[PDB]
Design a protein around this ligand. Structure first.
Ligand code: NA
Length: 209
């Protein structure tokens, strides 16, 4: 939470926009009339999310992901595990606390531009998916990823989450979470910020082996 003391109002994102942590200088949920059940991630949840990201990156890197359009995904020569980043997690959490599904306009930090994956599920029952389950939703996009084509040649709407997960240049991840009730839908919102950002148009996901 130490990051809350950084002045994000001085951060400038490539496409402009007021930084999320400048817009909201509070770490307290700000969800209109929605009923916030809980917010944040436990030490174990953060570790589980990190492990899932890394187990996935390694699966891909070792040439073990058979899914694709067509599969399999090629092995990687430069795939390193991600490490959890508290600042990314903080900014992700501030965004999550707005309960506004989608991407926030400016989330970059002092060190680099930042990418982001969001996940949301709603149920009529008072139950909330495990964070890892939401992460796997992003992974499954790999079924629609065609490695015979470069990154820009693929369908971003269908694979944009997958590509950010396996972006070789991305080295850090930090996520935020919140469970709320909106018009009787029990929703779990997961926001994960990545540093440095991935999904750059003229680049490849990772160096193939
Ligand atoms: Na296939």
């Amino acid at each position: 939470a130490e990051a809350e003391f950084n002045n994000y109002c001085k951060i400038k994102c490539l496409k402009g926009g007021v930084h999320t942590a400048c817009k909201y200088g509070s770490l307290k949920p700000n969800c209109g009339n929605k009923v916030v059940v809980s917010y944040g991630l436990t030490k174990q949840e953060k570790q589980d999310i990190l492990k899932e990201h890394n187990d996935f990156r390694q699966k891909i890197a070792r040439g073990l992901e058979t899914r694709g359009n067509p599969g399999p995904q090629p092995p990687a020569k430069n795939m390193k595990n991600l490490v959890w980043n508290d600042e990314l997690a903080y900014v992700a959490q501030v965004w999550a606390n707005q309960c506004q599904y989608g991407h926030d306009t400016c989330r970059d930090v002092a060190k680099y531009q930042v990418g982001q994956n969001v996940a949301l599920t709603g149920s009529t029952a008072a139950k909330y998916d495990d964070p890892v389950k939401l992460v796997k939703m992003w992974e499954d996009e790999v079924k629609d990823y065609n490695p015979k084509k470069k990154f820009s040649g693929n369908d971003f709407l269908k694979t944009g989450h997958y590509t950010q997960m396996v972006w070789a240049n991305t080295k850090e991840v930090g996520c935020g979470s919140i469970k709320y009730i909106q018009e009787k839908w029990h929703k779990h919102y997961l926001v994960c910020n990545y540093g440095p950002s991935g999904n750059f148009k003229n680049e490849e996901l990772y160096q193939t082996k």
